[PDB]
Amino acid sequence: ELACPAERSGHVAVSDGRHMFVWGGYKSNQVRGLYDFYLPREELWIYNMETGRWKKINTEGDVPPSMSGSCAVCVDRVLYLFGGHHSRGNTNKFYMLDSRSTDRVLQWERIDCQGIPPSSKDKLGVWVYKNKLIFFGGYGYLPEDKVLGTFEFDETSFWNSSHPRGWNDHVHILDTETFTWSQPITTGKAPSPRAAHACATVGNRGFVFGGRYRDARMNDLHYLNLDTWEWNELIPQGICPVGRSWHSLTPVSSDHLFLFGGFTTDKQPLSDAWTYCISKNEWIQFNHPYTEKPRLWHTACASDEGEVIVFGGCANNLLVHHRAAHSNEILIFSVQPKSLVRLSLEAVICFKEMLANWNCLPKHLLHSVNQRFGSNNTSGS
Amino acid sequence: SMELACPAERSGHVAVSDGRHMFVWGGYKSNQVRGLYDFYLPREELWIYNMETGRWKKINTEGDVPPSMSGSCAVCVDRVLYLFGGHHSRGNTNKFYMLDSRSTDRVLQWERIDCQGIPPSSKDKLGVWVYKNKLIFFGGYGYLPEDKVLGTFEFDETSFWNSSHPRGWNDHVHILDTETFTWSQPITTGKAPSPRAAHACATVGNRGFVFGGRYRDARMNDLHYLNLDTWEWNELIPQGICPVGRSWHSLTPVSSDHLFLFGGFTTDKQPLSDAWTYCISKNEWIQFNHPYTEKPRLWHTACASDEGEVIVFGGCANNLLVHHRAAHSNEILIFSVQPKSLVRLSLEAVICFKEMLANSWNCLPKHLLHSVNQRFGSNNTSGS
Amino acid sequence: MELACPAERSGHVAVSDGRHMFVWGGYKSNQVRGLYDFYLPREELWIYNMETGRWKKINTEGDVPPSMSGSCAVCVDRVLYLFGGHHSRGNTNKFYMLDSRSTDRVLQWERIDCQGIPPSSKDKLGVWVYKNKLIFFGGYGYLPEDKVLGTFEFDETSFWNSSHPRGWNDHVHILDTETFTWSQPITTGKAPSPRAAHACATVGNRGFVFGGRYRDARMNDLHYLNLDTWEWNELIPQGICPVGRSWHSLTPVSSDHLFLFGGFTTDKQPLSDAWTYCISKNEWIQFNHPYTEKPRLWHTACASDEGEVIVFGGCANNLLVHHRAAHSNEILIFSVQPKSLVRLSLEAVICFKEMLANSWNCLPKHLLHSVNQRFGSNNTSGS
Amino acid sequence: MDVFLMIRRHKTTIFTDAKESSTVFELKRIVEGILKRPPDEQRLYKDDQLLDDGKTLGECGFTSQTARPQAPATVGLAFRADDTFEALCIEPFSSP
Amino acid sequence: MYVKLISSDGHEFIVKREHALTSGTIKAMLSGNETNEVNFREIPSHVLSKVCMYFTYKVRYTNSSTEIPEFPIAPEIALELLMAANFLDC
């Protein structure tokens, strides 16, 4: 039985190069077009993209609630989780899960971090500099403490919430080891307060792209140089993408970034792909056979074989919950090309399916297989 | 923002209802600091869930407060809560408590009553019916009473392991006449059932229905009803397929011909989420359909609305006997076993189209809009 | 000192002449780290007497095969013949010969490039022996290289778990070892679905095939092949047939009766049940023995000349998780043919140890060798 | 654009990248720089067809889609061509 | 810069070294610029030609937003391609 998951958006999915861990999320209920059905609390839909399959497990411990819009990383196969918007509002607690253990059931653990906490908010960006996590931006409630950055309230949240929200550009260092909050002084022109913005990590350079300042959805590119805390706005030459939101700037190489999808101000979901070169400093458009599938609030993650794999998203708009029709498809975008293991894999699936067909197959050199097989002898039975 | 009105996740609380305002009090939780002992709630804490608007409300009370209960028997007659029984960190209690919840302009006060006659034993896990001006109490895990009490009572052996004071199952019938505030005991006739705790009770007219329970090492599920005028016990054997034998499950009357069952705990200690409904005229079990069957519950408190809804509050998803990993829940589950009025559908028609018709959201009548705005819409993408 | 058992493992190959079981190969989950799999080494041969009962370690020379996680072998005229198997470099299909008749010399392997169309590298297959011909059925492995009779279906998850997709086949190959020629007979009749993790049994000029896991479904249906007319025939038996399962084993206990023991079900549960098939009554009658609380999977079975089912190997618990692979190495003995008068004399002496130690010392020389060899270790003695 | 080259003669083949406006002289210079010998003594063959040496590869019919890296067209080579251009004898690959 | 390679049937071959930096078996076999003289006994010339061609493709289509095309594999050379993948592991 192939465990097909429920169609969803808002889930967090993290990649070590072998597994996306998919957790949390919400969906539009197809039976009841009245309220958005939040997904179950314990569900981990782990999709191996190297062995391309689904495996759902259940977790234990100090379990956080049903999150749609959180911020999660996976450092040395360890989940860290912050922020998000459960069914009664937003949170600002910190949670940790160990994904290295396979013998025992996975136990969550809430960690009360020392230092000044941020506000309860979601839709923010992360960059990972060694053991430190810098948190930037987002949408949510007002900052309770004296927090660096500019908070600007959304007016229409006044017409749709008991407590009004707004965007920010607040940076926060959380340590992964000592669990210390700190908040350094940044330099340069800090960008606009925004939500559904794109974060990408090369070195100590963190790139933020896109988002929706006020109600407009643009396409400006900024980067923070975290060793110097310097904000620089970078406008690339040549052709450029249009203004969008809900796009994941997933890196594919140390010179080259990949972007899938988008969502314009007119509330249209985009079905185009772009790549960016840092050294040429140029966006250039990618041609792909998934131009019929626009996705927003999706998870586009990086594999070790140079494939950007997208799970989730909605084929139409996500604003009206009755108009939301989610998707659970797996989308492959290999800007970095496929490997010889994968060209052997399309050599079998297209040209050996109907084929039954020289009797000479010896072997001379030994132990040249140890990055190929893995779990090999228990397969097929 | 400020902390919204949300009660803590728990198991073993007491929810009573007048059909319009549910009162939730007592219960306990697993302590996340250290799971060796179980954390108990503070004893002044009333929670009010409005089922028409769907909101919680914190209430402080004065008076002779009860201790921290972990499962007690209570009623909400004439918007007046009457509490009896329960288990606590001091032990078990048979003190009768009164909380006048009819005062809206005044804060509520407690009053412990030393009722006359022979009071019953200190006990928990029991059921109740309200007939005319009389409160009638049935069953209970608990002790032996101090005087002669009609009915049978068998000690549990395993309680002899876990506490100096040993409890056990009974099927005693007691009457508190609250016009005289006097205990009395009527004559029990008919084929009396086994002694049981964790028995689900309901009041259908002049009858009381008892389903399921625990006796010896068996979680039974036979069905009985006792008349409240002739005092005659009648054991009913229903047709169709029966729901699996189970304990720790509620059962409320949803109409004068129909009853509802959710949840349970199989004797093999497996948590249940199968929904059933019962027809007393057909004497028949129908397995009910709802999309809430993917989560099971322990000590799931159901209450009957005046709009025909089964409202479930609280529940342990996994094994409660694993108390150090007890996944307590504080999620309201609304089951539609009876169809709603257009008032409710009209508020649904408001609650569907929000961003298109936020002016009609802002231009309702004041109780209507309060109810509509009561819903704390889960905004996760608004503003992006 | 040297009463050391063979190590606990899974995927070994054990063959029988009726008197001396040959056990060779296999791998185990490592006790330091349970994720990777340590293959038990390729020079190691074990001989376990199935009558007297003991283990013998022989190092092997020649054109040595690599360690195998499961292969196919027969013992014809006390000569071992090996084909297939999966090694740490992946699957193999080289034909190996190990002449076990040389008791005066140490044993030498010989890898033989046979003529004709050999099948592709694979494993989890079955075999019959008819006259001089060794006939090979089934398998999970790679694509064959020439025109090979039978069909092939590629397993989907094999596509995911390596760059080598392995699929199941219902291929049949005759190795004529007098000429050492691969050949293929004509497949007539209703051929089975392409499957592996099955078992095979030989009744005279007939071949029985039981169970297996096509795709993910671990069916245990029965199929029948003539070894003279080459006609396939699916039999639907009466009685209560055994549950669908893979990783089981069959031995012929008699010319009218077949035996079956344990396995691994479709919903991932081991098995410790035992069944007996009657071909004249065509009936599956359940066999009772006090070893039904110990479930093993892919556990080898051998039929003795005196009529005992002797089972070695088989992971005690699950194996699809590698870190919980609790392998075993204990001998299970089941009697289906009754105990003979020579064997009643053998129990008459082996059962009275302390009361008849004088009768232990007063026995013929091979008998005493079998009695002082069968040493139940003394927990009770000492104080 | 980018045009990629097969050069096949006598169980030797040469993979070489170039541009569309590159002449046959520039690829002659780079094969002189690889194999360390005179490049003026060789002849190119578009399946036995001599090209003019001053012609750019846009005029030679070698485009990027025709000479894709994963699927490219070839030329043969013939050293000592001089006047007696070496007759082309490409030994092909073996049977699968 | 350009490295010599011998197939099973004796076909000589010359390799761009920056196209040859991807596969680890050859870079651990040769130099494990510098022109090496290495040899193979088993793998034929047609499936090897695909290997080097694949590398050039691999090198040309790395880090660009052009449409990366599908590569046609003939079914007669696909068994030797799975053989070459087993004996290369690129």
From Swiss-Prot, chain C:
Q: Which InterPro entries does the UniProt record give?
A: Kelch-typ_b-propeller
Q: Where are the Kelch repeats?
A: 8-62, 69-113, 125-184, 198-236, 248-288, 299-336
Organism, scientific name:
Homo sapiens
What's the name of its gene?
Answer: KLHDC2
What is the annotated role of this protein in its UniProt record? Substrate-recognition component of a Cul2-RING (CRL2) E3 ubiquitin-protein ligase complex of the DesCEND (destruction via C-end degrons) pathway, which recognizes a C-degron located at the extreme C terminus of target proteins, leading to their ubiquitination and degradation. The C-degron recognized by the DesCEND pathway is usually a motif of less than ten residues and can be present in full-length proteins, truncated proteins or proteolytically cleaved forms.
User: What post-translational changes are documented for it?
Assistant: Autoubiquitinated by the CRL2(KLHDC2) E3 ligase complex.
Give, from the UniProt record, the effect of changing residue 159 to A: Impairs oligomerization of KLHDC2-ELOB-ELOC complex
Q: What is this protein called?
A: Kelch domain-containing protein 2
Q: How does it assemble?
A: Component of a CRL2(KLHDC2) E3 ubiquitin-protein ligase complex, also named ECS(KLHDC2) complex, composed of CUL2, Elongin BC (ELOB and ELOC), RBX1 and substrate-specific adapter KLHDC2. May form oligomers as a KLHDC2-ELOB-ELOC complex; this interaction is autoinhibitory for the E3 ligase complex as the substrate-binding site of KLHDC2 is blocked in the oligomer. Interacts with CREB3; interaction is direct and specific as it does not interact with CREB1, ATF4, ATF6, JUN, FOS, CEBPA or herpes simplex virus transactivator VP16.
**Highest classification ranks of the organism:** Eukaryota, Metazoa, Chordata, Craniata, Vertebrata
Signal peptide positions on this chain? none
Consequence of changing residue 166 to A: Does not affect ability to recognize truncated SELENOK or cleaved USP1 with a diglycine (Gly-Gly) at the C-terminus
Q: Which UniProt keywords apply?
A: Kelch repeat, Nucleus, Repeat, Ubl conjugation, Ubl conjugation pathway
For molecular function, the Gene Ontology terms on record are: ubiquitin-like ligase-substrate adaptor activity
User: A Gene Ontology CC term for this entry?
Assistant: nucleoplasm
| Pathway connected to this protein | Protein modification; protein ubiquitination
Cellular location(s): Nucleus
Q: Say if the entry is tagged with keyword Lipid biosynthesis.
A: no
GO BP term (any one):
proteasome-mediated ubiquitin-dependent protein catabolic process
Q: Where would you say this protein principally sits, based on its record?
A: nucleus
UniProtKB/Swiss-Prot annotation, chain D:
* Keywords, alphabetical: Acetylation, Host-virus interaction, Nucleus, Phosphoprotein, Transcription, Transcription regulation, Ubl conjugation pathway
Q: Which GO terms describe its cellular component?
A: Cul2-RING ubiquitin ligase complex; Cul5-RING ubiquitin ligase complex; cytosol; elongin complex; nucleoplasm; VCB complex
One example of a Gene Ontology biological process annotation: protein-containing complex assembly
Phosphothreonine PTM positions: 84
Primary localization class, coarse: nucleus
Pathway as given in its UniProt record: Protein modification; protein ubiquitination
Q: Which domain of life is it from?
A: Eukaryota
Report the GO molecular function annotations: transcription corepressor binding; ubiquitin protein ligase binding
Residue numbers bearing the N-acetylmethionine modification: 1
Domain Ubiquitin-like: residue ranges:
1-66
Localization recorded for this chain is: Nucleus
What is the recorded function of this protein according to its Swiss-Prot or TrEMBL entry? Answer: SIII, also known as elongin, is a general transcription elongation factor that increases the RNA polymerase II transcription elongation past template-encoded arresting sites. Subunit A is transcriptionally active and its transcription activity is strongly enhanced by binding to the dimeric complex of the SIII regulatory subunits B and C (elongin BC complex).
Family, similarity comment: Belongs to the Elongin B family.
Query: Quaternary state and partners of this protein?
Result: Heterotrimer of an A (ELOA, ELOA2 or ELOA3P), ELOB and ELOC subunit. The elongin BC complex interacts with EPOP; leading to recruit the elongin BC complex to Polycomb group (PcG) target genes, thereby restricting excessive activity of the PRC2/EED-EZH2 complex.
Protein name, UniProt field: Elongin-B
Curated annotation (Swiss-Prot), chain E:
Give a brief account of the tissues where this protein occurs: Overexpressed in prostate cancer cell line PC-3 and breast cancer cell line SK-BR-3.
**Any one biological process term the GO annotation gives:** protein ubiquitination
Q: What is this protein called?
A: Elongin-C
Q: What is the role of this chain?
A: SIII, also known as elongin, is a general transcription elongation factor that increases the RNA polymerase II transcription elongation past template-encoded arresting sites. Subunit A is transcriptionally active and its transcription activity is strongly enhanced by binding to the dimeric complex of the SIII regulatory subunits B and C (elongin BC complex).
Family statement drawn from the similarity comment of this UniProt entry: Belongs to the SKP1 family.
Q: Does the keyword Lipid metabolism apply?
A: no
GO molecular-function terms, A-Z: protein-macromolecule adaptor activity; transcription corepressor binding
Stored InterPro entries: ELC1, SKP1-like, SKP1/BTB/POZ_sf, Skp1_comp_POZ
Pathway per its UniProt entry is: Protein modification; protein ubiquitination
Where located? Nucleus
Q: Which organism is it from?
A: Homo sapiens
From the UniProt record, list the coiled-coil ranges: none
Asked if the record carries the keyword RNA-binding, the reply is: no
* Gene Ontology cellular component list: Cul2-RING ubiquitin ligase complex; Cul5-RING ubiquitin ligase complex; cytosol; elongin complex; nucleoplasm
Family annotation (Gene3D superfamilies): Potassium Channel Kv1.1, Chain A
- Subunit annotation: Heterotrimer of an A (ELOA, ELOA2 or ELOA3P), ELOB and ELOC subunit. The elongin BC complex interacts with EPOP; leading to recruit the elongin BC complex to Polycomb group (PcG) target genes, thereby restricting excessive activity of the PRC2/EED-EZH2 complex.
Task: Name the principal localization, coarsely classed.
Answer: nucleus
Pfam families for this protein: Skp1_POZ
